[PDB]
A paper describes a structure:
Sodium glucose co-transporters (SGLT) harness the electrochemical gradient of sodium to drive the uphill transport of glucose across the plasma membrane. As the founding member of SGLT family transporters, SGLT1 is encoded by the SLC5A1 gene which is mainly expressed in the gastrointestinal tract and kidney. SGLT1 is essential for glucose, galactose and water uptake from the intestine and the genetic loss-of-function mutations of the human SLC5A1 gene lead to intestinal glucose galactose malabsorption. Human SGLT1 (hSGLT1) plays a key role in sugar uptake from food and its inhibitors show promise in the treatment of several diseases.
Here, we present the cryo-EM structure of the hSGLT1-MAP17 hetero-dimeric complex in the presence of the high-affinity inhibitor LX2761. We obtained a map with an averaged resolution of 3.20 Å. Therefore, the structure of the hSGLT1-MAP17 in complex with LX2761 represents the outward-open conformation. LX2761 locks the transporter in an outward-open conformation by wedging inside the substrate-binding site and the extracellular vestibule of hSGLT1. The glucose ring of LX2761 binds at the sugar substrate site of hSGLT1 and the aglycon group extends into the extracellular vestibule. In detail, at the sugar ring of LX2761, the C2-OH binds to N78 on M1, E102 on M2, and K321 on M7; C3-OH binds to the side chain of W291 on M6, and main-chain carbonyl group of F101 on M2; C4-OH interacts with side chains of T287 and W291 on M6; the methylsulfanyl group at the C5 position makes hydrophobic interactions with T460 on M11, L286, and M283 on M6. The distal amino group of amide bond on the tail interacts with D454 on M10 and its adjacent carbonyl group interacts with H525 on top of M12. MAP17 binds at the peripheral and interacts with M13 of hSGLT1. hSGLT1 shares all of the eukaryotic SGLT-specific features observed in the hSGLT2-MAP17 structure, including the extracellular shelter stabilized by three disulfide-bonds and structures packed by intracellular loops. We calculated the radius of the putative water pathway in the current SGLT1outward-open structure, showing the pathway is blocked by the intracellular gate on one side and also blocked by LX2761 on the other side. The overall structural alignment shows that half of hSGLT1, including M1, M2, M6, M7, M11, M12, and M13 are relatively stable, and we name these helices as the constant module.
Author numbering:
A (entry chain B): 22 to 55
B (entry chain A): 18 to 575, 621 to 664
The structure:
């Protein structure tokens, strides 16, 4: 389950960070435009 | 013999106790439904709690097809299949937040009814009802019955005829005249039993394989001793484990379930399965409020993370312990052990069940497998009855009373029960070593057009009945063309590669699903833009633009105060502030967990 030098659980952490940023960005965009 | 281990004692006791409990809950819920009116029978009265909705959403999807196919196919190529379940949760969240609010706000018992209301023609509803019923009767009934047969012949000694007959009778006693209230109240027990017994099995299997790390290492060297004999030896790819086994996202073309087709096509036909398919939505529309559907759908997604660790992983463990049985390639040995000449890969779960666990645990666990099958068959039967009564029977008699519709639904449940015993000869006799490939191909040909028509009937305003009809017809024609051309020539064996041309057979069925989605989408849009539109007056509360609008609606299919208030409440889709906040937060948490799991394995 290793890609590059990345640990299997670090993918989870990075993906969660990206998804949370996207949720916050989408919420902010929705608030600004609605 | 492998079919006599369950004969001892506690096996019989646990299965009979399970049957007694499920029948008892079904009957108790049968007398808690207010049957006799369509609102209370097919929609359970719009009084279901949140967590039974979630439980039913899980147990209607998860059947014997899942256990058998996931474990066996996991013995073929690793974690590749697990992501089905994982895509489910995202889309169920999407459903709960976007699709159910409109359907509740439209007062639509059936999805074809919603399409008629938005478009305004009888042919759309009739065609969708017939196509959805055919998809039911073929794909889902085949999955359930075949997998029933597989784990019955391997684990029990019961002939398919008697076993399927008995399962259908047990189901029939409460499904025929139970409606969604009985369905869900009996389904929560199915879900609980499945989760408990299957957690026990997965823990036992992981302990006996020596843990997850040793599981990984041992699995990759589970190569069957025999690779010779008969006419010829085999190409070192029909038996060796795959190097991309433990990754969900595989090569775009070289590997089975390539990641582009994986994510995109899987989402495309999962929008059909969850958001547009009748079986799952009825569970959401039978709710007590609008927050209860969101509670149910979050719970469904949360314990839809479980399936992989309970079906895919045990299959691998089945291969590691009994590699000679679940990895045979030689036709002689394969035909020897379980059945089909090519296969024996489909018996991974039932061999792991009948062997790994102790006597009582084997009994309870076999009853888990039965629990899986009954829920799905109940769901499909009730939803087929609703579709028939609401569209076809309704349009064959426009003056029908409620009682006549109820009796029509029940008779349709009876006939569709009989169709399953009519189905068992085909499933037993036919060479079904590649059955699940065919089931997924069938669902990957006729699904994407319906997914497109509904995603445009909701997230759009200009589409109209000509566009929807002709896009659906075109998509059907393309799907039937490919399906016939792939079945006539037949899908290729490992030793004997595919016969048919690369244009049709070379494309993975998920790639063709996405292509057909795009073609149906384009065709619907073009034909719709050629014909005059439907004014917004008829589309209030039926499209995502107009759901909040509270003006009077001219329906395209066109005490008093207490009845009006009851109707408005049934169409009411507003929850309290704090409950709405908690439901949004926990939904976000669910999608976060899914993203983490996707990233962890893939
Ligand atoms: C349609 S969408 C819908 O499906 C639901 C669903 C419906 C039917 C089955 C049986 C399952 C389990 C399964 C078994 C078996 C397989 C693979 C079989 C074919 C196969 O593996 N073919 C290879 C080897 C890749 C090939 O290319 N040759 C997939 C899933 C899952 C799912 O629960 C929903 O959540 C989702 O939304």
């Amino acid at each position: 389950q290793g890609l590059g030098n990345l640990q299997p659980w670090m993918q989870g952490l990075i993906a969660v960070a990206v998804f949370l940023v996207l949720v916050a960005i989408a919420f902010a965009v929705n608030h600004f435009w609605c | 013999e492998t079919h006599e281990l369950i004969r001892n004692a506690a096996d019989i006791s646990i299965i009979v106790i399970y049957f007694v409990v499920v029948m008892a809950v079904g009957l108790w819920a049968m007398f808690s439904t207010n049957r006799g009116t369509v609102g209370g029978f097919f929609l359970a009265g719009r009084s279901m709690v949140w967590w039974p909705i979630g439980a039913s959403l899980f147990a209607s999807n998860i059947g014997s097809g899942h256990f058998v196919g996931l474990a066996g196919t996991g013995a073929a190529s690793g974690i590749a299949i697990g992501g089905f379940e994982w895509n489910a949760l995202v889309l169920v969240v999407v459903l709960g937040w976007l699709f159910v609010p409109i359907y509740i706000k439209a007062g639509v018992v059936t999805m074809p009814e919603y399409l008629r209301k938005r478009f305004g023609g009888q042919r759309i509803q009739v065609y969708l009802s017939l196509l959805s019923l055919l998809l039911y009767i073929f794909t889902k009934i085949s999955a359930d019955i075949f997998s029933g047969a597989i784990f019955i012949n391997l684990a029990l000694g019961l002939n398919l005829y008697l076993a399927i007959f008995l399962l259908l009778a047990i189901t029939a006693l409460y499904t025929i005249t139970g409606g969604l209230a009985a369905v869900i109240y009996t389904d929560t027990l199915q879900t609980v039993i499945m989760l408990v017994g299957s957690l026990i099995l997965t823990g036992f299997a992981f302990h006996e394989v020596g843990g997850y790390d040793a599981f990984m290492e041992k699995y990759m060297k589970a190569i069957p001793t025999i690779v010779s004999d008969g006419n010829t030896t085999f190409q070192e790819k029909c038996y060796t484990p795959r190097a991309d086994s433990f990754h969900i996202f595989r090569d775009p073309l070289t590997g089975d379930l390539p990641w582009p087709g994986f994510i995109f096509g899987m989402s495309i036909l999962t929008l059909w399965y969850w958001c547009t398919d009748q079986v799952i939505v009825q569970r959401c529309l039978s709710a007590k409020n609008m927050s209860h559907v969101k509670g149910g759908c979050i719970l469904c997604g949360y314990l839809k993370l479980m399936p992989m660790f309970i079906m895919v992983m045990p299959g691998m463990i089945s291969r590691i312990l009994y590699t000679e049985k679940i990895a045979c390639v030689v036709p002689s040995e394969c035909e020897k052990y379980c059945g089909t000449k090519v296969g024996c890969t489909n018996i991974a779960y039932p061999t792991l069940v009948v062997e790994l666990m102790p006597n009582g645990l084997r009994g309870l666990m076999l009853s888990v497998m039965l629990a899986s099958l009954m829920s799905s068959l109940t769901s499909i039967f009730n939803s087929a009855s609703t579709l028939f009564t609401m569209d076809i029977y309704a349009k064959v008699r426009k003056r029908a009373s409620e009682k006549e519709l109820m009796i029509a639904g029940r008779l349709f449940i009876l006939v569709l029960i009989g169709i399953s015993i009519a189905w068992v000869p085909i499933v037993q006799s036919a060479q079904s070593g590649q059955l699940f490939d065919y089931i997924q191909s069938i669902t990957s040909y006729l699904g994407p057009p319906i997914a497109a028509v509904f995603l445009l009937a909701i997230f759009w305003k200009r589409v109209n009945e000509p566009g929807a009809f002709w896009g659906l017809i075109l998509g059907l024609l393309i799907g039937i063309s490919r399906m016939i051309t792939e079945f006539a020539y037949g899908t290729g064996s490992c030793m004997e590669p595919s016969n048919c041309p690369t244009i049709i057979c070379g494309v993975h069925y998920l790639y063709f699903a996405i292509i057909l989605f795009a073609i149906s989408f384009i065709t619907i849009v073009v034909i719709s833009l050629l014909t005059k539109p439907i004014p917004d007056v008829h589309l209030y509360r039926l499209c995502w633009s107009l759901r909040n609008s509270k003006e009077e609606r001219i329906d395209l299919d066109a005490t008093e105060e207490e009845e009006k208030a009851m109707k408005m409440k049934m169409t009411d889709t507003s929850e309290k502030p704090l409950w709405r906040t908690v439901l949004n937060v926990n939904g976000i948490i669910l999608v976060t967990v899914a993203v983490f799991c996707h990233a962890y394995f893939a």
